Design a protein around this ligand. Structure first.
Ligand SMILES: CC(C)(C)c1cc(NC(=O)c2ccc(S(=O)(=O)N3CCCC3)cc2)n[nH]1
Length: 289
């Protein structure tokens, strides 16, 4: 019956307040838009509540989580508008695209990789201090501004720990990146995101996560039973070590995000976030050629 759902949103016509511009591409379509009064560029996600009917609980969880976050490393939520069955969510616009998009032209140098990982770790450190678990860390959900600032995105399956619930047990995530304890529905916590981060670190170096040669349902079955993936090939030892630390089957051995920010791979290859604009420049040249 969605009692209390409409109460949380503004019931004014969003078409009167925003100008829906270019389409970009969970739950619905994203557009680069503009606030008609302040002239600020925003991202507008439009969800069809009839099409996404079975995911209403997840749509609500996303807005609740986004509203409770206040950090430069987490995509900002400006507000939401309800127009019949269409819900418009006004979000921070990140014009640099995703880390997955920036991988399309070719391989990423370790300086870029470690800088992106350091920014993801700040986001995770913030979420984990707020008792939140992202639960869907992957390069697709790592977004960049046009100045190179890195922000975590997509909180539809995010989890919240409280005193009644010290651990989560929900089977959520994208199979290749999912933690063995999440797949098994064991009581898990923040360490699930540290494993996803390790998969994402391999993804940033290879353009695809480990085990991309396997069917996703086979990877779900095998992840908890087999040895964890490793970073194979022409990569530095501190990078391979960073991946090994993240990818321990026993979550007790995975370091916290705070501990990972001091890792040799991070302190040795990181540079200013502003240097990530070189990846946006490379993408522009790549698409123009
Ligand atoms: C709603 C949320 C998720 C907060 C959002 C998304 C979001 N931005 C984008 O989704 C986005 C923006 C641009 C492109 S691009 O194709 O122009 N590009 C150029 C460099 C690499 C590719 C691709 C994606 N901002 N906010």
């Amino acid at each position: 019956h969605l009692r209390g759902f409409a109460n949380q949103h503004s019931r004014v016509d969003p078409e009167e307040l925003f100008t829906k511009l270019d389409r970009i591409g969970s739950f619905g379509e994203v557009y680069k838009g503009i606030d008609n009064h302040t002239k600020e560029v925003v991202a507008i996600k439009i969800i069809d509540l009839e099409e996404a009917e079975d995911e209403i609980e997840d749509i609500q969880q996303e807005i609740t989580v986004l509203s409770q976050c206040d950090s430069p490393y987490i995509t900002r939520y400006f507000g939401s508008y309800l127009k019949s069955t269409k819900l418009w969510i006004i979000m921070e616009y990140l014009g640099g695209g995703s880390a997955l998009d920036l991988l399309k032209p070719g391989p990423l140098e370790e300086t870029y990789i470690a800088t992106i990982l350091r920014e993801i770790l700040k986001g995770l450190d913030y979420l984990h201090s707020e008792r939140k678990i992202h639960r869907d860390i992957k390069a697709a959900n790592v977004l960049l501004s046009e100045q190179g600032d890195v922000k975590l995105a997509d909180f539809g399956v995010a989890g919240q720990l409280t005193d009644t619930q010290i651990k989560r047990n929900t089977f959520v995530g994208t199979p290749f990146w999912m933690a063995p304890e999440v797949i098994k529905q064991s009581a898990y916590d923040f360490k699930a995101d540290i494993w996803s981060l390790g998969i994402t670190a391999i993804e940033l170096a290879k353009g695809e996560p480990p085990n991309s040669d396997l069917h996703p349902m086979r990877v779900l079955f095998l992840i908890p039973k087999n040895s964890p993936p490793t970073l194979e090939g022409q990569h530095s030892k501190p990078f391979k070590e960073f991946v090994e630390a993240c990818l321990n089957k026993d979550p007790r051995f995975r370091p916290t995000a705070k501990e990972l920010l001091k890792h040799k791979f991070i302190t040795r290859y990181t540079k200013k976030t502003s240097f990530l604009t070189e990846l946006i420049d490379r993408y522009k040249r790549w698409k123009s050629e």
